[PDB]
Design a protein around this ligand. Structure first.
Ligand SMILES: O=C(NCCCCCn1ccnc1)c1cc(-c2ccc(F)cc2)cc(O)c1O
Ligand SMILES: [K+]
Ligand SMILES: [Mg+2]
Length: 213
């Protein structure tokens, strides 16, 4: 019995099917009262919501799904017809995320891609019929934020205005990614100071808007 299975069971028994807000509230209650887990959380989640509402992206890519908390958070605010693709290397987490989206009634808006982001990103154009991405949410291996951002550019997946939103830039931290985007004329950066999910520890989101080559 895993922590991720316990979170999914808790949602199924304490939230309303087809109600994404109740799913988010149940995950946040479980993680504050029972066991911490690496979901983006409500503090950083409110900043995510404000970014999503500002840009109303039609196609979002997420790197790292975990239990589907951030996928539910983003997908619930997407416009009819807009889509989210989420890459998850851990098959057990991918199965939890699929069941979380199904319970939230968001399954038609989100596609889980099982595998490594370094292998899946080069297949987006030809296999998944992607042209360019409107937004990317980075929440996977912290040492992969920079290489995958460089890979997205190489693959022609970024366009002028693509919004990169990165979790955990302070804790655990993404020092090479932060230094790179903040020092590059190809990105316009904004830091949103906040708190590590379910903890009185400072963390933050970085928004890095791609400006073209
Ligand atoms: O490691 C994290 N995420 C990546 C999980 C593996 C992704 C693998 N993958 C998925 C797809 N392709 C590759 C993470 C960790 C923490 C944290 C903070 C404080 C602490 F004391 C311990 C941990 C907080 C988060 O918010 C995080 O996201
Ligand atoms: K999450
Ligand atoms: Mg995170």
């Amino acid at each position: 019995d895993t922590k991720e299975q316990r979170i999914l069971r808790y949602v199924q028994q304490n939230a309303k099917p087809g109600d994404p807000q109740s799913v988010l509230e149940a995950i946040d209650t479980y993680c504050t009262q029972k066991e911490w887990a690496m979901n983006v959380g409500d503090a950083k989640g409110q900043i995510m919501d404000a970014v999503i509402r500002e840009y109303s992206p039609s196609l979002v890519l997420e790197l790292g799904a975990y239990c589907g908390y951030s996928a539910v958070r983003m997908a619930r605010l997407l416009q009819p017809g807009a889509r989210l693709l989420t890459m998850e290397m851990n098959p057990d987490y991918a199965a939890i995320t699929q069941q979380m989206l199904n319970f939230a009634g968001l399954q038609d808006k989100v596609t889980i891609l099982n595998g490594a982001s370094q292998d899946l990103i080069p297949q987006l154009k030809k296999k998944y019929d992607v042209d360019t991405l409107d937004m990317v949410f980075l929440d996977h291996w912290k040492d992969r934020y920079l290489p995958d951002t460089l890979l997205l550019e190489k693959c022609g997946l970024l366009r002028k205005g693509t919004v990169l939103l990165a979790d955990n830039v302070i804790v655990p931290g993404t020092p090479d990614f932060l230094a790179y985007v903040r020092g590059s004329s190809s990105f316009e950066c904004t830091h949103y100071s906040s708190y590590l999910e379910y903890m009185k520890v400072v963390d933050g989101l970085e928004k890095a808007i791609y400006q073209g080559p």
